[PDB]
Amino acid sequence: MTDFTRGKGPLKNTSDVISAAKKIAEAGSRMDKLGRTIADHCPDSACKQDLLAYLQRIALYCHQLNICSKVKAEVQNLGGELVVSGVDSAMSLIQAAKNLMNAVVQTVKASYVASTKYQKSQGMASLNLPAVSWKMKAPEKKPLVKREKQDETQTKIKRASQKKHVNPVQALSEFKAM
Amino acid sequence: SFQEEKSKLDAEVSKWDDSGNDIIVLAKQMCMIMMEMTDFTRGKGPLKNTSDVISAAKKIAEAGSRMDKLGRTIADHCPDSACKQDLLAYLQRIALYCHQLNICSKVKAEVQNLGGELVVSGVDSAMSLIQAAKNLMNAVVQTVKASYVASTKYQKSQGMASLNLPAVSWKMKAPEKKPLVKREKQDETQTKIKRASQKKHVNPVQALSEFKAM
Amino acid sequence: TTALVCDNGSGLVKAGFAGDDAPRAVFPSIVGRPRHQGVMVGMGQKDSYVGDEAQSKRGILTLKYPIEHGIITNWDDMEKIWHHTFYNELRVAPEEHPTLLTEAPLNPKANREKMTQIMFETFNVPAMYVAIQAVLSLYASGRTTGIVLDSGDGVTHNVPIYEGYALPHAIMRLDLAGRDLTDYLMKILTERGYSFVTTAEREIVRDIKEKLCYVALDFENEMATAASSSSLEKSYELPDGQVITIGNERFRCPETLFQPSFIGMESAGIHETTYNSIMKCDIDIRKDLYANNVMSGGTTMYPGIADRMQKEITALAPSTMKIKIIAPPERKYSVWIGGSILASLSTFQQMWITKQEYDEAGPSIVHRKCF
Amino acid sequence: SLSPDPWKRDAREKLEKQQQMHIVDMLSKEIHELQNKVDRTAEESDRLRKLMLEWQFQKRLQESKQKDEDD
Numbered sequence A: 001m002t003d004f005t006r007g008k009g010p011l012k013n014t015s016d017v018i019s020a021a022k023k024i025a026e027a028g029s030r031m032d033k034l035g036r037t038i039a040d041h042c043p044d045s046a047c048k049q050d051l052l053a054y055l056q057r058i059a060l061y062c063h064q065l066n067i068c069s070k071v072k073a074e075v076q077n078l079g080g081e082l083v084v085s086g087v088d089s090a091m092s093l094i095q096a097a098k099n100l101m102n103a104v105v106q107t108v109k110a111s112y113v114a115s116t117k118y119q120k121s122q123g124m125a126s127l128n129l130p131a132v133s134w135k136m137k138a139p140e141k142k143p144l145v146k147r148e149k150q151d152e153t154q155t156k157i158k159r160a161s162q163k164k165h166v167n168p169v170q171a172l173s174e175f176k177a178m
Numbered sequence B: 001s002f003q004e005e006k007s008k009l010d011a012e013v014s015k016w017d018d019s020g021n022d023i024i025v026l027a028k029q030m031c032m033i034m035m036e037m038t039d040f041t042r043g044k045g046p047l048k049n050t051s052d053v054i055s056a057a058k059k060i061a062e063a064g065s066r067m068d069k070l071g072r073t074i075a076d077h078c079p080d081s082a083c084k085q086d087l088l089a090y091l092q093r094i095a096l097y098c099h100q101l102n103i104c105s106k107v108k109a110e111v112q113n114l115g116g117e118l119v120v121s122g123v124d125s126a127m128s129l130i131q132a133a134k135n136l137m138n139a140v141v142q143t144v145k146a147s148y149v150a151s152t153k154y155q156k157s158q159g160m161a162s163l164n165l166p167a168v169s170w171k172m173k174a175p176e177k178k179p180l181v182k183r184e185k186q187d188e189t190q191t192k193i194k195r196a197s198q199k200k201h202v203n204p205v206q207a208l209s210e211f212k213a214m
Numbered sequence C: 001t002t003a004l005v006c007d008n009g010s011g012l013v014k015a016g017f018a019g020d021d022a023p024r025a026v027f028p029s030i031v032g033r034p035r036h037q038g039v040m041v042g043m044g045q046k047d048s049y050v051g052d053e054a055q056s057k058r059g060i061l062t063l064k065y066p067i068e069h070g071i072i073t074n075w076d077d078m079e080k081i082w083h084h085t086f087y088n089e090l091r092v093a094p095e096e097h098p099t100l101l102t103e104a105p106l107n108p109k110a111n112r113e114k115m116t117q118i119m120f121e122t123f124n125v126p127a128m129y130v131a132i133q134a135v136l137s138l139y140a141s142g143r144t145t146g147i148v149l150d151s152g153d154g155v156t157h158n159v160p161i162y163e164g165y166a167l168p169h170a171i172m173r174l175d176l177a178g179r180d181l182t183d184y185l186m187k188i189l190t191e192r193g194y195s196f197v198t199t200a201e202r203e204i205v206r207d208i209k210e211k212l213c214y215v216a217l218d219f220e221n222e223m224a225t226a227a228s229s230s231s232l233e234k235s236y237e238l239p240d241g242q243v244i245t246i247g248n249e250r251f252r253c254p255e256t257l258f259q260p261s262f263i264g265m266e267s268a269g270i271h272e273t274t275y276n277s278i279m280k281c282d283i284d285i286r287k288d289l290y291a292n293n294v295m296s297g298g299t300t301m302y303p304g305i306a307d308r309m310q311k312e313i314t315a316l317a318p319s320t321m322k323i324k325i326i327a328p329p330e331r332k333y334s335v336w337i338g339g340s341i342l343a344s345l346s347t348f349q350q351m352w353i354t355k356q357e358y359d360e361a362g363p364s365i366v367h368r369k370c371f
Numbered sequence D: 001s002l003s004p005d006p007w008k009r010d011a012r013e014k015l016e017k018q019q020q021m022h023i024v025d026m027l028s029k030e031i032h033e034l035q036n037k038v039d040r041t042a043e044e045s046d047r048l049r050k051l052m053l054e055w056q057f058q059k060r061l062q063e064s065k066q067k068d069e070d071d
């Protein structure tokens, strides 16, 4: 659905996006169930509190996708596609989708930390903890110096550096099976 | 699973054997008679001439008297509130329309018998009876809805027992969802005089169909 | 079971069940009483008409609005409307349905305290909650960061929100909405010889505005093209068959939103009201607030209002940045849709105002919880 | 699943509408079957009477509803 804006993906029109909205939202409910089981067995600590913070956000984003997609569906039938002929109505659902994914990435890392930290702890038995089925990659080494280029000479106004936002593909690619 | 849901028919079809003991069934019969009289205007119903309209008017007037009696006896036991006043108002309206129907029907019958059929040969004579009938039907629909609301509001009070209250034997379906966005058309270039949209009136067939039985 | 969601505004009343996608009852918020002598026996018993039935009998009634400028002024008529929507519109018993109410920001405290008292004492609901209209518009937009411009029938206000956090010190409320545009149109129409003075005739003028008025991209240039030719003329047919004609008044009426000095108000236009609200926020979040500019309410339904706002903002903001305007097709029901999302939410089921808490705290419980 | 969703309610409404649109066909078939039997029984008159009344009211409602889709 992110690639739908550029029009180079499997989706072709607005109705495809609406169908994709239900699928990602329905998968959100199962993610909430999986995460909450670990939190209940984890003893109260900083990791458990962080884990439950994101599970609050998953419920809000998932519920928004269900109701908002239904509204976009009814508007399509009444006024025709020419009402939604512009792609502007599409980014309403796309914005909530990437908002949900940011919380999903965060709760995966929080769930992993609690599993590894309290792997031996009582109550974690008979559970599919990520600590027994996945491993973390060591983070990449930082550059010792930012190499200068010749493009800064052309620009007469020095601006602040753009903040680097993590890509969910790269955030999940660091997981490796045992 | 198709076989066991035939109880919906049996529950629904069993409401028609009361013989004028329930509000909703009497109102439905009223509605059928009024629909027949209305369709007489186009000459596409059981009524073929004026005398049929006179007989239908007498029948619907008698039904109106029975409905007024039932409304009064259901309104007496309700404690004074905002719902009771509406019920009394529509009961008075029903009484007035029933009396008008009776007297006008008798006068039309006398005129037809005296001056012959050619005096009432034009259909313009029967419009008065049709107008009175539809006014009575609107009043009856309003009083049925008001009676249901009053009965469901005060069904736990004393004296409400031994009454076939419509809130006990009938249930009201929830209203349908409004359209989110107004339908767009090409009327802007088809006509060049914008006009206020005519307000849709409640068809008495629909407002009564939304009652469901258990 | 199902929780009612009632959004009562100055002009219209919206109600329905939480979790749905559209309201189940939309009727005008007027109460009319007869003003003529009754001569036919039995036809004068009814003394008050509420909602749609009052609108069909304008000819023999005096219409009044219980709510003006987002403030309830007639508490006797307001209870009449709330009873109409619970029994004659939704056909539900309030005793087993918690309800959600809405109210504009920067509103007197006594408004919501007395609203809560009626719900618990008169209709006997199990729980309730009062929310902010501008906040609920963000729920329906699928966003958590943006500035909401809500303009209804009585009040226009701006609320900036960043990452789910509100900035109360940057909220601007302006008492100028559709009802003030209707009054200006009646005065303006007298130049052509048309007079509408009756309250029933104000409903006619309101319908004229909704079908013929629009916002001009450039007011000064449009006025030049109005006088030279007659290509902007359109005709409207009155209920009695009379035909009226509108010239430059089509775009003069909605222009007072950007030039409030037409009505005599000293305040600034809605274009630079939003800019002032943005500039009162922190410098770091102004980038995400210039984009994600959400419009809501029926007053923002004029053709070309979104394009006009973008042009005016771009002339004020720095040229390096980008300004976006979000105008959903269903923005007339955005407030209600957000209310349905919030009421049916799983995580929200713990912050209702139960009747037990009202017993030990009274109406003042709403300030500490509802906010 | 986490929260009530409008799609399930929409499916319920569609199923209810289809059930209501098939029960009338069942009623019409029952009327046709009891009408065409030459033999008559005492415990059949009341049933058949209520059946024509219900069918006639349903047909009137359908005819009134159909016109609302036009102008």
Ligand SMILES: Nc1ncnc2c1ncn2[C@@H]1O[C@H](COP(=O)(O)OP(=O)(O)O)[C@@H](O)[C@H]1O
Binding pocket: C008, C009, C010, C011, C012, C013, C151, C152, C153, C154, C178, C179, C206, C209, C210, C211, C297, C298, C299, C301, C302, C332
């Ligand atoms: N299509 C339209 N064009 C212009 N003005 C409109 C339009 N629709 C509604 N309005 C005006 O905006 C108001 C919309 O009211 P609404 O936003 O539904 O609730 P509230 O009463 O809370 O404002 C109405 O009073 C009406 O005068």
Ligand SMILES: [Mg+2]
Binding pocket: C009, C133, C151, C152, C153, C297, C335
């Ligand atoms: Mg509003």
